[PDB]
Every structure is written in C-alpha cells, then in structure tokens.
Amino acid sequence: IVAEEVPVITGFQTVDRKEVGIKLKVVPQINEGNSVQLNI
Amino acid sequence: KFVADERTNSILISGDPKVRERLKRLIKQLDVEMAAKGNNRVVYLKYA
C-alpha cells in the first residue's frame, strides 16, 4: 500500500479517515518452471 | 517345536538337529525384507 488518508465527513461535521493510493495484493504460485499464476 | 522373542526378534527352536538343519534353513528362508514400495508419494502440483 502506498496511500495518504485525507479526512472524510459522513455527517460541526464528523470526519472519517480512508486511504487513497496504490495498493497491490498478490498471491503467486509458480508452475514448476516459467509461468507464474497470479491471484491479483 | 518353535519359539521366538521379539525382544531379540530371534527364532528359538525345540527339537531335532534335523530340526536344526531344516530350521536353520527356515531361519534363513524368511529373513528377507521387502524393498520399499513408495507406499506414499508427495506430488508437486504444477497448476491446481
């Protein structure tokens, strides 16, 4: 995750932090040679 | 007649020196140990 969280108001107004940025969640498994399978 | 111990894992015998001849023969006959059969196998899945 690369992100910066700006303040968010979902309501004197309430603010909720959420993150905007680049996130990459990957779960590779390798064919016993070469090709890689990616759940991304 | 016949004995053995599996403390020692040894045939004991009661009887003839003919029983000693033939039952040293069977002392020797089933001493053999089976070669490993690969009873279990670890398989590397390529994809699934």
Determine contact: B38 vs chain A, CB below 8 A: no
Please name the residue of chain A whose CA is at the shortest distance from the CA of residue B47: A31
Resolution (angstroms) equals 4.2
Q: CA torsion, points B18, B21, B23, B27, in degrees to nearest 10?
A: 170
CB atoms B44 and A32 under 8 Å: yes
CB under 8 Å to B20, separation ≥6 — which residues? B13
- CA–CA min distance B44, chain A (Å): 8
What is the number of alpha carbons within 13 Å of residue A11 lying toward its C-beta?
Answer: 5
User: Cα-flanking dihedrals φ and ψ of residue A39, to 5°?
Assistant: -95, 110
| Method in brief | cryo-EM
